[PDB]
Ligand binder design. Structure first.
Ligand SMILES: CCCCCCCC/C=C\CCCCCCCC(=O)O[C@H](COC(=O)CCCCCCCCCCCCCCC)COP(=O)(O)OCCN
Ligand SMILES: CCCCCCCC/C=C\CCCCCCCC(=O)O[C@H](COC(=O)CCCCCCCCCCCCCCC)COP(=O)(O)OCCN
Ligand SMILES: CCCCCCCC/C=C\CCCCCCCC(=O)O[C@H](COC(=O)CCCCCCCCCCCCCCC)COP(=O)(O)OCCN
Ligand SMILES: CCCCCCCC/C=C\CCCCCCCC(=O)O[C@H](COC(=O)CCCCCCCCCCCCCCC)COP(=O)(O)OCCN
Ligand code: NA
Ligand code: NA
Lengths: 124, 124
C-alpha cells in the first residue's frame, strides 16, 4: 500500500511544485508540497493552500485528480483488502497465537529449570 | 459512482446558489458553491460558509440533506461495493496478471530476437 501510495504522492507533488512559481509562503518546496498533499489523506487538506501559479485550472485539476485517486480510491481499496485479509486468516491467527504461547511456555520452563530442574515435571 | 455523485452535487449546488443572493465573498457563483459542497466529501466542509440568504432554515436543511445523502450514504455504499468487488475478483486478477506477464515475455523475446534469434530456445 505504501509503495503505491508514495508513487502517486511523489508524482503529483512533483507536478504541483513544478507548476508553482513562488511569486508567497515559500510553498515552492518539495517537502512542503508533499506534506500539504499528505494532509489531504488525513482529512485536513486545504484545496487552495497557495496562489503562486499562472494557471488555476491546471492546479485545481491536479488537486482533484489526486484527491479522487488517493483519498477516494486507494484508501477504500485498502479498507476492502483489509476486510478480505481478516476473513482469510480468522483461523490461522489462532494457530499462530498457540505456537507463540507454546514457545513462551518452553522458554519459561527452560529459564526456571535452574530453580527446579525436575521438580515441575508433567504427568505421573 | 461519479455519474451519480455529480448528479447529486450539481442538483444541490444549483439549488444552493439559487437560494444565495450575495447581499459577501461573492459566493453567488456556481463554481464556488460546487467547490464548497465538494469539500464536504473530503471532511473539510464548513456548514456555515455564507450568510447571504433570506431563509436560514432552507439553507441548513439543504446542506444537511446533501451531507446525509452523499457523505454518509453514497460513500459508504461505494465502500461496500468495492469490498464486494474485491471478493469477486480475488482469483480473476491472478489470471489477468499471468496473461500480462505472458505478453511481457513474448514482447521481450521478440525484441531480443535481433540480438540472438535462435540462441535462446526452450527445451532440448
Ligand atoms: C486531464 C487533461 C485535462 C487538461 C486540461 C487543462 C486545461 C488548460 C487550461 C489553461 O491552459 O489555462 C486556463 C484555463 O481556463 C479555463 O477555465 C479552462 C476550463 C477548464 C477545462 C475543463 C477540463 C475538464 C477536465 C486559463 O487561466 P489564466 O490564463 O490564468 O487566466
Ligand atoms: C468544467 C467547467 C467549469 C467552468 O467552466 O467554470 C469555470 C472554472 O474555472 C476554473 O477555475 C477551472 C475549474 C475546472 C475544474 C473541473 C474539472 C475537475 C475534474 C478532475 C478529475 C469558471 O470559474 P471562474 O471563472 O474562476 O469563476
Ligand atoms: C423537505 C421539505 C422541508 C421544507 C421545509 C422548509 C421550511 C420553510 C421555512 C421558511 O420558509 O422560513 C424561514 C425558516 O423558519 C423556521 O424556523 C422553519 C422551522 C424549521 C422547519 C423544520 C422542518 C423539519 C424538516 C424563516 O426565516 P426568516 O424569514 O429569515 O426569519
Ligand atoms: C426542527 C426544529 C428546530 C427548531 O425549532 O429550532 C429552531 C431552528 O432554526 C433554524 O435555524 C432551522 C433549523 C432546522 C433544521 C432541522 C432539520 C434537519 C433534517 C434534514 C434531513 C431555533 O433556531 P434559532 O431561532 O436560530 O436559535
Ligand atoms: Na475525516
Ligand atoms: Na477534517
Amino acid at each position: 500500500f505504501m509503495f503505491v501510495y508514495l508513487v502517486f504522492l511523489f508524482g503529483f507533488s512533483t507536478a504541483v511544485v513544478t507548476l508553482i512559481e513562488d511569486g508567497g509562503n515559500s510553498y515552492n518546496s518539495l517537502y512542503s508540497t508533499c506534506l500539504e498533499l499528505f494532509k489531504f489523506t488525513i482529512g485536513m487538506g486545504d484545496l487552495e493552500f497557495t496562489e503562486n501559479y499562472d494557471f488555476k485550472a491546471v492546479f485545481i485539476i491536479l488537486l482533484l485528480a489526486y484527491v479522487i485517486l488517493t483519498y477516494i480510491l486507494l484508501l477504500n481499496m485498502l479498507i476492502a483488502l483489509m476486510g478480505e485479509t481478516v476473513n482469510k486468516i480468522a483461523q490461522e491467527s489462532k494457530n499462530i497465537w498457540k505456537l507463540q504461547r507454546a514457545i513462551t511456555i518452553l522458554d519459561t520452563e527452560k529459564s526456571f529449570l535452574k530453580c527446579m530442574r525436575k521438580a515441575f515435571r508433567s504427568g505421573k
